[PDB]
Structure formats: structure tokens, C-alpha cells
Amino acid sequence: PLMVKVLDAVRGSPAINVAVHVFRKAADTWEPFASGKTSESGELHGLTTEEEFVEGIYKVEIDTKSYWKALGISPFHEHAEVVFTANDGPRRYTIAALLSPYSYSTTAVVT
Amino acid sequence: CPLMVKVLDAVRGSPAINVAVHVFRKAADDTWEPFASGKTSESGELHGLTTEEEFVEGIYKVEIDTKSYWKALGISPFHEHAEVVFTANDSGPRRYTIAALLSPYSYSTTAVVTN
Amino acid sequence: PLMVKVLDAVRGSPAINVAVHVFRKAADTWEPFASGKTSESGELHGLTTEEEFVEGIYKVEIDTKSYWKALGISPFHEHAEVVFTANDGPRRYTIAALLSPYSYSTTAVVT
Amino acid sequence: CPLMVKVLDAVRGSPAINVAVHVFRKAADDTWEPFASGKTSESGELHGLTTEEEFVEGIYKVEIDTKSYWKALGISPFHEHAEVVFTANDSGPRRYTIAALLSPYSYSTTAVVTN
Numbered sequence: 001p002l003m004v005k006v007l008d009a010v011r012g013s014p015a016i017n018v019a020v021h022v023f024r025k026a027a028d029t030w031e032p033f034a035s036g037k038t039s040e041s042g043e044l045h046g047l048t049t050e051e052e053f054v055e056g057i058y059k060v061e062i063d064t065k066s067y068w069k070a071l072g073i074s075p076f077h078e079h080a081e082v083v084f085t086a087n088d089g090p091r092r093y094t095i096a097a098l099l100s101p102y103s104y105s106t107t108a109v110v111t
Numbered sequence: 112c113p114l115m116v117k118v119l120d121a122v123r124g125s126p127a128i129n130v131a132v133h134v135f136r137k138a139a140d141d142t143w144e145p146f147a148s149g150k151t152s153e154s155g156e157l158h159g160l161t162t163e164e165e166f167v168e169g170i171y172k173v174e175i176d177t178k179s180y181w182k183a184l185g186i187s188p189f190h191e192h193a194e195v196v197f198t199a200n201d202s203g204p205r206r207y208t209i210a211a212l213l214s215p216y217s218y219s220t221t222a223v224v225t226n
Numbered sequence: 227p228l229m230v231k232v233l234d235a236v237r238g239s240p241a242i243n244v245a246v247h248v249f250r251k252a253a254d255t256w257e258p259f260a261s262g263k264t265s266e267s268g269e270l271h272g273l274t275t276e277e278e279f280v281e282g283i284y285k286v287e288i289d290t291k292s293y294w295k296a297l298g299i300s301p302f303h304e305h306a307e308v309v310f311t312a313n314d315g316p317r318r319y320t321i322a323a324l325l326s327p328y329s330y331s332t333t334a335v336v337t
Numbered sequence: 338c339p340l341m342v343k344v345l346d347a348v349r350g351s352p353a354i355n356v357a358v359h360v361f362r363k364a365a366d367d368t369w370e371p372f373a374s375g376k377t378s379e380s381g382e383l384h385g386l387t388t389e390e391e392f393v394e395g396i397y398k399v400e401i402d403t404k405s406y407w408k409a410l411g412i413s414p415f416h417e418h419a420e421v422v423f424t425a426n427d428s429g430p431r432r433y434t435i436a437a438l439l440s441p442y443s444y445s446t447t448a449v450v451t452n
């Protein structure tokens with residue numbers, strides 16, 4: 001139900017081994033929910049299941065700064081954060097992020 | 112200024128007017144402290160948020176209230192807000208323009224950093 | 227060897243049934259090379275084969291204006307045109323385009 | 338203004354200076370006629386391309402020479418150029434800002450259209 005895809009606009013490639021953390025807003029604060037690293041294809045699958053991914057407000061933090069640091073390029077952002085309300089009925093969500101050192105774009109494909 | 116925010120609407124091809132913007136700075140105890148806030152003008156710009164003296168080195172968060180913007184135009188957007196988080200003035204004072212381009216299910220943000 | 231993917235930033239969906247034309251620069255002008263329409267997944271595959279897709283300068287024209295017109299939204303651009311030199315050795319190219327009425331982004335994933 | 342072009346570099350977070358820009362207008366016989374050209378200033382802006390009288394209704398093409406820009410910085414970029422093609426002044430005179438954000442394998446272009 002939730003997929004994250006990250007691309008690198010400097011090299012024209014998937015952004016591989018980018019750490020991604022997902023959080024859910026608690027009744028009070030952000031509670032950790034899921035995490036992983038992007039694959040060779042810049043994709044992270046399997047973050048959650050249909051049963052666990054209930055309506056709520058979620059945050060996806062993509063660790064863009066470590067990615068750029070590993071390539072030797074000075075970035076602007078600490079990370080890219082995408083915050084969205086889910087399921088306002090169940091859908092598949094692809095959160096896609098296109099990364100440059102001083103700029104990022106994020107889009108949601110909801111199907 | 113040292114810090115300007117510019118917001119554009121990619122559906123209308125126009126500046127995004129009356130968009131709330133909240134700026135926070137990370138404290139010594141790792142909390143986010145309110146730093147400044149404002150709303151974008153008829154030109155999509157928000158000037159005047161801070162001064163060179165108050166805008167010290169730190170990690171800053173700029174949160175643009177894109178959801179209220181879309182909802183007032185009748186759109187239910189995907190994102191709650193657009194948030195940009197960055198280290199400022201680490202190599203000395205700079206001037207920063209934070210630009211965001213908004214669509215209902217996408218946004219882009221760019222920084223222009225000058226001397 | 228060449229894939230085109232198109233997304234709709236207004237609806238957060240694949241951009242379906244978008245006409246795509248591909249051209250190669252001739253020794254003189256743009257010569258038509260391939261075309262098709264994006265699928266339900268916003269993808270267009272099968273434009274060309276490894277043997278036909280030689281080094282050269284190619285143009286991909288995506289008919290964004292008809293897409294927006296079909297949805298009842300007034301667009302700015304006539305089309306989105308991506309022009310690139312290929313194979314400067316053989317690679318798989320994904321040309322991705324994210325569409326809004328007054329803005330588009332295009333990226334190349336070369337693998 | 339009636340026509341301005343702005344170009345930013347997403348690798349450096351800075352305006353894209355000395356970028357060649359060529360503007361064409363589609364003729365009655367369906368050819369592209371040269372209309373105006375210029376290069377971006379130290380602020381990434383190109384002003385002065387045309388006047389209200391000469392900028393009639395038509396289909397215009399703005400071609401930004403992004404490849405020469407990247408190559409002068411030592412980068413072999415994906416795109417030959419960024420080209421924006423649009424109908425202008427169909428509902429009366431407007432002012433157009435064509436903004437492009439450049440990376441080596443990506444670019445975005447946006448239009449701000451005002452009265």
C-alpha cells in the first residue's frame with residue numbers, strides 16, 4: 001500500500017541506498033512506523049501492510065543529506081519530508097522524490 | 112533581508128497569494144522553537160521574516176501551509192504542508208530564497224543561496 | 227531501450243492516453259521515428275528496438291495540451307519536448323515527465 | 338517588458354548566468370522565424386527581449402541552451418536544450434515569465450502569466 005521511489009537528477013539514476021523513515025502522527029507527536037533503504041532500482045517496497053496502514057497523518061522522511069554526502073556533493077536540505085493524510089478509503093500510494101543538491105520535487109501517485 | 116520565501120501555483124501560473132508560512136529553529140535541547148511567521152503577498156513573496164543579527168547559524172524549518180491554500184480554491188490536496196529543513200549560515204552569513212512550486216499532488220522546492 | 231512515463235500532478239495519477247511522438251535529427255530536420263499513446267499506467271513501451279536506436283539526436287514530443295483539454299483545464303504549453311543525444315554506448319532510457327497545467331518537469335533515468 | 342526568462346541552477350543553488358536564450362515565433366507557413374535572443378544576466382534573468390507592440394498573438398518557442406551551460410562547468414548533461422512552446426496573448430496582452438530550473442539530467446519549466 002505504500003511505495004517510495006527516489007531518483008537522482010545529477011546522475012540520471014535511481015537514488016540507491018537512501019534511508020527512508022516513516023512516521024504516524026500520534027494522538028499527542030511523531031511515532032516511528034516503518035523504515036528501510038532504497039534498492040538498486042531506487043524503490044522501497046514492503047514498508048507496511050493493508051491491515052496496519054489505517055487512516056491517519058503520515059510523514060515520510062528521506063535522508064537526502066547522507067546520499068549527497070556519500071557522493072561528495074554539498075547539499076542544501078537536511079532531508080526531504082513528505083507529510084500527507086492517508087486513506088481519507090484505502091489506496092496504493094507511491095511517493096516519488098526527485099533529488100538535486102539544492103532542490104527536490106515530490107509527487108504522489110495514488111491508485 | 113536574509114530569508115525570503117516565494118510560492119507559485121502551477122495550476123494557475125500565478126503567485127500563490129496569502130499562503131501562511133511558519134519558520135522554526137532547532138534549539139540546544141533538539142526541540143523546534145518558533146522563529147518567525149508571515150503570509151505571502153500579492154506577488155507570492157514573503158519578505159521581512161528576520162534580520163541579519165537574529166538569523167544566526169542554526170537548523171531552520173520553513174513550513175508552508177499548502178493545504179489551506181488548495182482547500183480555499185476547492186481542491187483537496189495530497190500534502191499537509193511543504194516543509195524545507197536546512198542548515199543556515201554555517202560558512203558565514205548568506206541570503207536565502209526558498210522557492211516552492213505547488214500543485215495539488217506535487218510540490219518542488221529550491222533554494223537560491225547568495226553572498 | 228526507450229521508455230516514456232508521464233504523471234499528472236493535479237490528480238496524482240498516471241497520465242493516460244497521452245500521445246507521444248519521437249523523432250531523430252536527420253543529416254539536413256526532424257524525421258518521425260516512433261509514436262504511441264501512454265497506457266493505464268502512464269507508460270509507453272516498445273517504441274524502438276536495440277538495433278534501430280543508434281547514436282543520434284532524438285526529440286520526444288508529448289502532447290500535453292490535448293491531455294489538459296480532455297480534462298477541461300486550460301494549459302500553458304503546446305507540448306512538452308525533450309531533446310537529447312543518445313548512446314554517446316547503448317543504455318536503457320526512461321524519459322519521465324510530470325505535468326501541471328502551467329509547469330512540467332522532465333527527467334532522464336539512464337541505466 | 339512582456340517576456341522575461343529566468344534560469345536557476347539546482348546543483349549550485351544559484352542563478353544560471355550567461356545562458357543563451359533564443360526565441361522564435363511560428364510563421365503563417367508553419368516555419369519557426371527568429372524573434373529575439375539574449376543571454377541571462379548575473380541574476381539569471383533575461384529582460385528586454387521584446388516590446389508590447391512587437392509581441393503579438395502567436396505561438397512562441399523559447400530555447401534555453403542548457404547544454405553549453407553544463408559543459409562549461411565540466412558536466413555532460415542529458416538534454417540538448419530546454420524548449421518551452423506556448424501560445425501567447427490569445428485572450429489579450431499578458432506579461433510572461435518563463436522560469437527554468439536546471440539539473441544535469443532534469444529540468445523544470447514554469448510560466449507565470451499576469452495582467
Ligand SMILES: NS(=O)(=O)c1cc(Cl)cc(Cl)c1
Pocket residue numbers: 005007094096097098107109231233320322323324333335
Ligand atoms: N519523479 S518522476 O515523476 O519523474 C517519476 C515518478 C515515477 Cl513513479 C517513476 C519515475 Cl521513472 C519517475
